[PDB]
Amino acid sequence: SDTVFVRETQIPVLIERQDNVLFMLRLNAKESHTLDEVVLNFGKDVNMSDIQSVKLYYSGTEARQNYGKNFFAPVSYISSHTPGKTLAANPSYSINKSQVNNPKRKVALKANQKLFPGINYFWISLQMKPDASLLDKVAAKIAAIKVDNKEALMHTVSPENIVHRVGVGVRHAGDDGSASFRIPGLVTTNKGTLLGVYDVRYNNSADLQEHVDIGLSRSVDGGKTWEKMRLPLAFGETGDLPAAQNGVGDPSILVDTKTNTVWVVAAWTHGMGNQRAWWSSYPGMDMNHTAQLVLSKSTDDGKTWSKPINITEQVKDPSWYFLLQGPGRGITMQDGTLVFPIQFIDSTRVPNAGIMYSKDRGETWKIHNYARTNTTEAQVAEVEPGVLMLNMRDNRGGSRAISTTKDLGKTWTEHSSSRKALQEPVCMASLISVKAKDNVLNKDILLFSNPNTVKGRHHITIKASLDGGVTWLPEHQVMLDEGEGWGYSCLTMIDKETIGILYESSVAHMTFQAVQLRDIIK
Amino acid sequence: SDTVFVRETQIPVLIERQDNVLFMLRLNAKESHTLDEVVLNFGKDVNMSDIQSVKLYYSGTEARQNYGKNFFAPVSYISSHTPGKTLAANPSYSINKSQVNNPKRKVALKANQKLFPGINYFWISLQMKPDASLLDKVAAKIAAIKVDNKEALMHTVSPENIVHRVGVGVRHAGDDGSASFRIPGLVTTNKGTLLGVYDVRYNNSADLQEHVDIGLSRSVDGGKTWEKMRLPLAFGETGDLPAAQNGVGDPSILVDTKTNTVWVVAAWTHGMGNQRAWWSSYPGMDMNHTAQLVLSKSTDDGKTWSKPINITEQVKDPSWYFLLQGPGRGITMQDGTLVFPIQFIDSTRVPNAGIMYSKDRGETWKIHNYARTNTTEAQVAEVEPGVLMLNMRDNRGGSRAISTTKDLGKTWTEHSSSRKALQEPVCMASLISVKAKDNVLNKDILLFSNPNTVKGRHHITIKASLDGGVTWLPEHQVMLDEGEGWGYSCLTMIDKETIGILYESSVAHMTFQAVQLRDIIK
Numbered sequence A, B: 001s002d003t004v005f006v007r008e009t010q011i012p013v014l015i016e017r018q019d020n021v022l023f024m025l026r027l028n029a030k031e032s033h034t035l036d037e038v039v040l041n042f043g044k045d046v047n048m049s050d051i052q053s054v055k056l057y058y059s060g061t062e063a064r065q066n067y068g069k070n071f072f073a074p075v076s077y078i079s080s081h082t083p084g085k086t087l088a089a090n091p092s093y094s095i096n097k098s099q100v101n102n103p104k105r106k107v108a109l110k111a112n113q114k115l116f117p118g119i120n121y122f123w124i125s126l127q128m129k130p131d132a133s134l135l136d137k138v139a140a141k142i143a144a145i146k147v148d149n150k151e152a153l154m155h156t157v158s159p160e161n162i163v164h165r166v167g168v169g170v171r172h173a174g175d176d177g178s179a180s181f182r183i184p185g186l187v188t189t190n191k192g193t194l195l196g197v198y199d200v201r202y203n204n205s206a207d208l209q210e211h212v213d214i215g216l217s218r219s220v221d222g223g224k225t226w227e228k229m230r231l232p233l234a235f236g237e238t239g240d241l242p243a244a245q246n247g248v249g250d251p252s253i254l255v256d257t258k259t260n261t262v263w264v265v266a267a268w269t270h271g272m273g274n275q276r277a278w279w280s281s282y283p284g285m286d287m288n289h290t291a292q293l294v295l296s297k298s299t300d301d302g303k304t305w306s307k308p309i310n311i312t313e314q315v316k317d318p319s320w321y322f323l324l325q326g327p328g329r330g331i332t333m334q335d336g337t338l339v340f341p342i343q344f345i346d347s348t349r350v351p352n353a354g355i356m357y358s359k360d361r362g363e364t365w366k367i368h369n370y371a372r373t374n375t376t377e378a379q380v381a382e383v384e385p386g387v388l389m390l391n392m393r394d395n396r397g398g399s400r401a402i403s404t405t406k407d408l409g410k411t412w413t414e415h416s417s418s419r420k421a422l423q424e425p426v427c428m429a430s431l432i433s434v435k436a437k438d439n440v441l442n443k444d445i446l447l448f449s450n451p452n453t454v455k456g457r458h459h460i461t462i463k464a465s466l467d468g469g470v471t472w473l474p475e476h477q478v479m480l481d482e483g484e485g486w487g488y489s490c491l492t493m494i495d496k497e498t499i500g501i502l503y504e505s506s507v508a509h510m511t512f513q514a515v516q517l518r519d520i521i522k
């Protein structure tokens, strides 16, 4: 007898999407002729008034050579890549067989779908209310599938008690005329305002050099709604060159907690043809030879931004090929010191991570020594007062490097977790420190986010450490996105009990989610 | 002292484009500081009334690691790929420094461009009037370049007496909601109407299987203007599957010269997931196992098209994995037999080209034997009465295979030109015969078009033979497109003195050009 296999997804449910893949179904119809209906029950705690519709789609069959590979779909159903067409299921891949608007907890979805004599794919789509709260959690179970007027056998390969979390697609492919958005940074101001920054990569998703601005989305309601995109840094046709030879990218953002002034640092690349700035920036100091380190500041909680402030000459060794920030965010130290992670390719063309700091509220910056050779993107957190922990993307592969410094980068001490505790596929990763005074657990905690793999950028995960980054217990981890994406992410605390994350996801170029601190540390 | 190097282009000038690349300029400014102007002189026989404007663009500099590679641009200036943005220069890559509308034969284009200390790229854009004639030829020279208020040294690397030809983008990326268009076929009806067919590849440029229709563009004025796109073959959700599991593609079109009935044959692939039909079609006969060979016919000069006629059972051996037409066009023999090239993957998984014919005006069809093993796409021409010449894509690489048959494909003879006379990069190629009475030279001629290379799909060229394909003299050739593209093309005779070609070019997915026969046979 035939069996319907079910795979529940673990990806963000975007509130503004018209479709979100909730379940996939595979039926090899050796004897079945017609699928009549699917019955769904949402969990008892689901807020049904926040759900707009539930839909059953049929997506056809599979290539015969792929029978037996345990696939649950023939193709990706909802594009996150096609400009202007990432909110709804592609109708050429998926036929809407059933839809229920304003559903009850129990949903019957009538298909009456004639089955291909072979593999058949179906899937269930969840659409939220535009009004839905960011803390919504959705659970559901397929109760019954009727085939040829009989109850069909079912087998679920996905784990029990999946928690489906919602999110906001802050930026989608095509938005505001830009092909792509990448490289998130995220902070919370002293006024609780959320500020998320990113590359606006207009022509395609290529790294610098290209037509790239720094964009910024501002939320005054905890990430539920976002003001129209701002452009803190954009160089257009500066210095008489085309805009695509004036990109500025890889932003890092920090809040000066002593004054609430907000700083964005980025790498402005001038010239370099259409080639990658990693290989096209050279020794020197002016815009014709090397990438420029530029700042923009806001003294009004992120609403308006200064013209660019060039600090290259403060901190760049002329012998370096390329000095730029570590993308993501910076910090204010307890003693008021401002710190941005940085990275420089030295005279031998080897990259090294470190930090840059200001003791005068951002007027002047300085770099001492690198933390570790052959490392690039890094994030820094004050794990204990006066102790900066730098967590680094390591070109050796497979795991983050971690070191600490108590003299602002003069000397570095390798940490026990280094090259062991936090696996990576060589990719940006976020690290923040939350102090006992500032969170609902009255405990010092470290939060880290990245693709929890050694190969490929998928299974984006937030991990928590309770012993200052010595131990990252699998118990204290939340897996937000099992799909593939570009992998970058940046964390902040929305408030004393809620984590905010802005990251490159499988469902939107810039995806924002709120995760209760108690969900990850129960 | 500095030299400005000039490379004149050899690509079609699209009449509906706002920009076309005419000249590229490179100036390594070791001494120079400002480029003041470029003076252009159109040839004496150019019709200036058909020229809407000329423009001088600055496109910046080059990555230092690319100096000395003789590049003349940092990037492609005008996309033929980006949906909805293939008609005008990408503004982020090129700054419009000056423009002259309704120019005189001699034109000064100012720049006053401050030069980058290094490589500097400029280019000249040519924009035609929308009502320009397809037969327009544009010749031009750069008479002077002023740098620092002195005449600069010039060196032209491209040949003298380049003839720039206009054309029409019948189909552009994004038109009518389709991401791409591929695989041209072209015929001229008994009433002088031009009919061009192609894949409409809605989602992206992938081969079958995918969401693909056969589209058709019809022109009653020699290809100057084209009627709204028709869809002779489209299967949507046939057989209860999604449209993307019902693509129909690789069209071939022929005119029955005895009646003017027009026939289009294509391959309808049903099911197969989202995989390539080349690997997903299997032995068998019905739509759930193997690609279907389908026809549509028109008895009103291409204005309306019949429902599909499935002829698979007439001609397919069940043991073949895949039987399909050879894309492009077919023919009517002098004796009234209709002939479509075909190709089949046999039970040993090797493709073989051949021909399919009808002796009863297309009601029934037959296939005898393949002409050559490990061959795929082919085109057929009646070189003399009763002698069919099959010109074939050969997987061995490097050159077309050519064989002939006098018994409609029961037996075949390798031709002297085979695997020698016509190089190819393994790609579709067009072949037609124009009989003495039907052209102004009063001689039987063969016309051939393909990428005139052994590697890469570029330098699309029409070649003429005056001796039944025994020799293809280099002087009887016109190179239409030096740029890179998907490479396919199809020829027809617009009238007794004019060749028409529809092909995948570097400037438009479907590009139509008209070439006077005397241009190719002087």
Ligand SMILES: CC(=O)N[C@H]1[C@H]([C@H](O)[C@H](O)CO)OC(C(=O)O)=C[C@@H]1O
Residues within 6 Å of the ligand: A183, A207, A208, A250, A276, A277, A278, A376, A377, A427, A486
């Ligand atoms: C200036 C620059 O190139 N930044 C890129 C960075 C860099 O290339 C790499 O870290 C060097 O190893 O990597 C990637 C990435 O998605 O992997 C995105 C960043 O934009």
Ligand SMILES: CC(=O)N[C@H]1[C@H]([C@H](O)[C@H](O)CO)OC(C(=O)O)=C[C@@H]1O
Residues within 6 Å of the ligand: B183, B207, B208, B249, B250, B267, B277, B278, B324, B376, B377, B427, B486
């Ligand atoms: C049915 C199919 O796949 N046709 C494709 C054809 C085929 O794959 C190849 O000829 C086999 O070798 O090649 C290509 C090509 O641009 O080279 C496009 C055609 O759509």
